[PDB]
Amino acid sequence: YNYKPTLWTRADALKVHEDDPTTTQPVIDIAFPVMSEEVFIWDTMPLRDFDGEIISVNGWCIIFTLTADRNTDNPQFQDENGNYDITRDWEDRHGRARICYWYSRTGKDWIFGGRVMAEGVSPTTREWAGTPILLNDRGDIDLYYTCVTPGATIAKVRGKIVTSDQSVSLEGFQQVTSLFSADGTIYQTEEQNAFWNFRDPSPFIDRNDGKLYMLFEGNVAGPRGSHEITQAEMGNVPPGYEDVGGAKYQAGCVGLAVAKDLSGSEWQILPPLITAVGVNDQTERPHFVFQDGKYYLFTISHKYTFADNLTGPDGVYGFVSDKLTGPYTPMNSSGLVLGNPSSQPFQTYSHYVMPNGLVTSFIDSVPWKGKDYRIGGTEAPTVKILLKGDRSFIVDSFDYGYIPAMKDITL
Numbered sequence: 332y333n334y335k336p337t338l339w340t341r342a343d344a345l346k347v348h349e350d351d352p353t354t355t356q357p358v359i360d361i362a363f364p365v366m367s368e369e370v371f372i373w374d375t376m377p378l379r380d381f382d383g384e385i386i387s388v389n390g391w392c393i394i395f396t397l398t399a400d401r402n403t404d405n406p407q408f409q410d411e412n413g414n415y416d417i418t419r420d421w422e423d424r425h426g427r428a429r430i431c432y433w434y435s436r437t438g439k440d441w442i443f444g445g446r447v448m449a450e451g452v453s454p455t456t457r458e459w460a461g462t463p464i465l466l467n468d469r470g471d472i473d474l475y476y477t478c479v480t481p482g483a484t485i486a487k488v489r490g491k492i493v494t495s496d497q498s499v500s501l502e503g504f505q506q507v508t509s510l511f512s513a514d515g516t517i518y519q520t521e522e523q524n525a526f527w528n529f530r531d532p533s534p535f536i537d538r539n540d541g542k543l544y545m546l547f548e549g550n551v552a553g554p555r556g557s558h559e560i561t562q563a564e565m566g567n568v569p570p571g572y573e574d575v576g577g578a579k580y581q582a583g584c585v586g587l588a589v590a591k592d593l594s595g596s597e598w599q600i601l602p603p604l605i606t607a608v609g610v611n612d613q614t615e616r617p618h619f620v621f622q623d624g625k626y627y628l629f630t631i632s633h634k635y636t637f638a639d640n641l642t643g644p645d646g647v648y649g650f651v652s653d654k655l656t657g658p659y660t661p662m663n664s665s666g667l668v669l670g671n672p673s674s675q676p677f678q679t680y681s682h683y684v685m686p687n688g689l690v691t692s693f694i695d696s697v698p699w700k701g702k703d704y705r706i707g708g709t710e711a712p713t714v715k716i717l718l719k720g721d722r723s724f725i726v727d728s729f730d731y732g733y734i735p736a737m738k739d740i741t742l
């Protein structure tokens with residue numbers, strides 16, 4: 332592999348425009364419904380195949396979610412005078428993240444199928460985001476996911492989906508295989524950075540190559556703050572914009588790995604496809620859409636993970652290329668594909684662009700009056716974007732949590 336990474340540059344970031352109507356999510360209505368009064372969900376991982384297509388099994392649409400319990404009645408989460416503090420609860424959720432699954436014949440109105448892995452199966456208590464892949468017409472599934480604290484390790488667990496006429500259940504998911512961790516030469520380690528990023532496996536079979544790959548979030552290797560900003564990372568900045576502040580501490584990247592064979596048992600770490608040194612620290616949940624012979628690389632990020640003297644909205648950013656290993660071009664010239672409106676900047680997150688143009692999100696925080704907001708923990712309205720060359724256009728909206736399958740497999 333003789334390739335060079337594409338840099339997302341400060342010059343690119345300066346082009347990022349908030350509240351572009353073609354590139355901005357509709358405003359979440361504060362009277363939004365919730366899909367469960369018992370649990371929170373946020374990161375949503377639809378069941379798909381190695382080609383990236385959303386798959387239904389025996390007419391059942393399937394999604395996996397990062398999940399946690401609503402502590403409505405637990406005394407630990409009580410306000411002064413003994414009231415349930417929904418906010419403190421919601422914001423403490425990442426520590427108790429578990430992966431659950433839901434099912435529906437309609438892609439809507441989801442039924443809770445419960446927990447994927449029994450407690451104690453995951454090496455780490457935290458089960459963070461990844462991808463469920465349908466291996467088989469017998470229903471076998473490899474759940475790639477992230478084991479966090481201690482450390483950060485990409486891993487997989489095999490199981491199996493069994494459908495009935497009116498319900499769906501899971502078998503297996505009893506043994507987790509750790510695949511790899513940050514190496515220190517290419518991707519940044521805990522040793523080098525206590526706040527290092529390493530998570531979110533999205534496996535895929537390349538159509539031109541036939542080989543098994545995966546994207547993941549990472550940081551560029553090196554001790555924290557040792558990265559320097561050269562004119563490469565700067566890009567072709569305008570006069571008066573040479574001041575980068577503490578940009579040295581932002582070193583986000585989209586990592587790449589390749590499997591020895593399609594079983595996905597052993598993985599060789601490769602150089603990153605996208606690096607954002609001096610621009611953004613977090614390029615999370617990377618994922619591909621394959622369209623018009625092109626590689627559409629999407630990755631989500633935050634307003635407040637941008638480097639100094641740079642800004643953008645919370646949402647999904649994107650890059651397009653003719654080949655897997657680049658060179659990539661930022662979507663819509665700046666990289667921004669779908670951003671939250673500035674009036675409700677944190678209404679949604681974890682935008683997952685599917686090959687049918689549908690984009691799913693979970694509702695985080697919707698403003699009401701002054702400093703108070705309503706928290707969600709439920710799916711946002713699914714939007715459709717249209718991809719055209721290196722430009723995206725939002726095109727219409729569907730119902731809350733609408734995640735239809737593109738293809739049905741009979742077992």
Ligand SMILES: OC[C@H]1O[C@H](O)[C@H](O)[C@@H](O)[C@@H]1O
Nearest residue numbers: 422425633677679680681695
């Ligand atoms: O754990 C901190 C989290 O805060 C919010 O939920 C953000 O949406 C999420 O991206 C971030 O990681």
Ligand SMILES: OC[C@H]1O[C@](O)(CO)[C@@H](O)[C@@H]1O
Nearest residue numbers: 374425428460530531615616
């Ligand atoms: O638990 C949620 C975690 O997973 C992500 O959504 C993607 O990596 C991050 O935003 C967060 O740290």
